[PDB]
Each structure stands twice: as structure tokens, then as C-alpha cells.
């Protein structure tokens, strides 16, 4: 009864090793959730947006490693809000294998704040709420040390922030959170 979509930051600043670390993390997260009724989908975002696999694609090939392996980093700027809209509209759509009456979960992993985005969070968040999309955020690195950067995460995520926001020091620290998130992807 769960439909998990990943919105992964593939912007320039993420070094190749750290991108593969994030790829490996997503992979691991899917392996650990081998429940016949859990479907996964992935979109990469920067200034460009790419669907790597739909819920339909995943159902027809449930191997997480085979799906994650070919993903190549987009590079460029950060347009988080547009990504969220494109997830809600494209990934969570019946044509792409999205199951109605199944829990809508979005996991956002980002290394920095959105900038130069045509859309704002006020243009995307209410629609995601309306569609019943529970969203989790993993803020990676030093970009999320300020108070204004932290509120961005709290905006991105579902209320309360204490139950939906993660923050890690670096991409190597993603291995360290592989537990408490599994204990958040249940129903």
C-alpha cells in the first residue's frame, strides 16, 4: 500500500563519488523495502529534469541495482520547486503506474538551496498537500547550517519538521541514516 518516489539533486556541486554514494543509498533503501506492494520511482533534477524509472517500469523490473546503475548526473543549477511539481504531476500519475488509494511518499535528497527557479515553494507545496504527498527531505552538507537554509528544508518537508527532516554532514554519512528512514517507510 506504498508508492515511494525519489527526487535526487544532480546539480554541479555534487562530486562524482558523492553522486554514486547517493545512488548507492537509494539502491540500498529499495533493497531493504522488499515488500511486493511497495513501488518506487526516481527523478533527477538540477536545472533540467529526468525520470529515470516510473512506478510501472519498476514493477516490470524490480531490481534496484539494475535501475540505479545507468543514472548519469545532470549537472548545473538547482530548481527544487520545479522538481517537486514535476514529481507530483509526472511520477504520481496513473499512466506511469501510480496506484490510487496507495500512500504517496516523496524523498528529496539535496546538497544546496534552490536558486533561480521559475517556481517558488508556494506554487508547488499546496498542490502536493492537496494530492496527499508525504514528503521527506535529506539536507546534505554545509549548505544547511544557517537558519534560513534550515527553514527551506522545513518548507520542502511535510509538517512537523522534526518527523520529516533529515540532515547529514556529507554523502558518506548517508550510510549512517539507512536505519531510521526504513522506520519511516512503512504505511
Amino acid at each position: 500500500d506504498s508508492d515511494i518516489a525519489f527526487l535526487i539533486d544532480g546539480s554541479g556541486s555534487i562530486i562524482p563519488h558523492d553522486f554514486r554514494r547517493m545512488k548507492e543509498f537509494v539502491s540500498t533503501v529499495m533493497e531493504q523495502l522488499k515488500k511486493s506492494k511497495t513501488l518506487f520511482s526516481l527523478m533527477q533534477y538540477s536545472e533540467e529534469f529526468r525520470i529515470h524509472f516510473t512506478f510501472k517500469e519498476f514493477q516490470n523490473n524490480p531490481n534496484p541495482r539494475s535501475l540505479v546503475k545507468p543514472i548519469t548526473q545532470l549537472l548545473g543549477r538547482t530548481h527544487t520547486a520545479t522538481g517537486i511539481r514535476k514529481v507530483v504531476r509526472e511520477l504520481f500519475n496513473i499512466t506511469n503506474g501510480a496506484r490510487k488509494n496507495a500512500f504517496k511518499i516523496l524523498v528529496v535528497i539535496t546538497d544546496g538551496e534552490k536558486f533561480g527557479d521559475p517556481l517558488g515553494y508556494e506554487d508547488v507545496i499546496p498542490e502536493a498537500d492537496r494530492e496527499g504527498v508525504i514528503r521527506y527531505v535529506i539536507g546534505v552538507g554545509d549548505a544547511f547550517r544557517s537558519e534560513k537554509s534550515r527553514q527551506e528544508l522545513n518548507t520542502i518537508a511535510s509538517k512537523p519538521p522534526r518527523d520529516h527532516v533529515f540532515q547529514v554532514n556529507n554523502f558518506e554519512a548517508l550510510k549512517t541514516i539507512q536505519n531510521q528512514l526504513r522506520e519511516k517507510g512503512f504505511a
Partner: antibody
Amino acid sequence: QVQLQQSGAELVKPGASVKLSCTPSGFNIKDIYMQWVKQRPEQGLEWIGRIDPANDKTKYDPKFQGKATITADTSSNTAYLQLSSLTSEDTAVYYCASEGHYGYDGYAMDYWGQGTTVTVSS
Amino acid sequence: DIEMTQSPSSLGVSVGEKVTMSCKSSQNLLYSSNQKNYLAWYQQKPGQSPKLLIYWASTRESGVPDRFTGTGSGTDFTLTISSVKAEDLAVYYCQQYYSYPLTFGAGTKLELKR
């Protein structure tokens, strides 16, 4: 030893189409964002748009929507600009420029082509 | 669209003088996450293509002499030539590369005063 080589000067009739090319003789197009910039005689620089030749994803200035089409051919390591339904307003110098990927969220335009003259006259 | 407002449009220069050029954007160009200003300066010599001179508002591109100095943050930016050489007579354009559409300033033409 690393430069952007552009196609020759063009003379075209109004309402026609024209296709300009840009070939980097020093690096691979997949590794950059290829940009096109318009420069009318005595006017500044006007950004047309850019392409990610790695996935063929483009962005344009809405002013150029319809008029310009940016394409790339990784095989021949060439980026193209197509201008359609030409008017005298299209008579300018066209530069291709590259934005390298250097480990930051974006970058400036580090390499520029020599320019391609495009004249539109009946 | 972000508006790049360059001042002055033309500038009377003598060799060895210290010149300044202004570039002001309608929007902030400092990205919080990397603490970098998404501003570049280009030099376009007569009948030549533009050339990247300064990026990140203050970083000199390889080959650029120390006489050229970029300063500023957020909105107000300055290009400074300490001791102008004759080879420096050109049009200087500023560009924002923070968001799309990428926008250029009107340019500052340096001319020799007499």
C-alpha cells in the same frame, strides 16, 4: 590550442531558414553547455539559448521561441543553431559559447567562437 | 528577466589612469549555498569575439593581468583597471548567470581621451 570553430558568413532571402554550426577543436561537447548569443551591429549581446549535448535538453529566451532551434551532434562534435522565417531583424553576428562544468552549480561562458555573419535581404 | 545596468555607456580614458565601471542587477546574484556571485565580465576588442575576463565577480580568468580587478556583492558590481594600457580599449560587458534567461549589460566602451 582549444577554440570554438564556427561556420562561414551567410546571405539569405527573407522567410528562409539558416543553420549555423559550432565545432570545438579541443574538447567534447558532452562535457559542456553550448550557448548561442546574438549581437546586432550597434546593440549589445542577446542570449538566444543553450543545449546540454549529453541529453539534448535545451533552454531558450522566450523572445526566440519559434525563431531559434538549438541542436547538437555528438558524433561530429558539433552544436547547431537554426533560424527560421528570417526577417531583417535577424541580420546580426551569432556567437556560440561554452559553459564548462567545473564542480559548481553553473558557470560563466569561458570559450567563445569567432562569430557567424548572417545577412537577411531580398 | 534580470536587468544588468552598466554605467557609463562610454568612458574617456588616458594611458596609465585608473578606471572604474559599474554593473547593477535588478535581482541578487549571491547564491547562499556556495557564497558566490553569479557575475561575469567580458572584454570585446574591436572586430573580435567577447572574451571571459572575470567570473564569480572577482576571480580573474587565466591570462588576465592583475591590473583588472572585479569587486562587489549581491547587486552592485565594479570592474577596475589600475593603470590602463592602450591594448585595454574595448567594450566591457557584464553578465548574470544566476538564472535563465542569461542577461548581459549594455556595455562600457573605453575610448581614448584627447
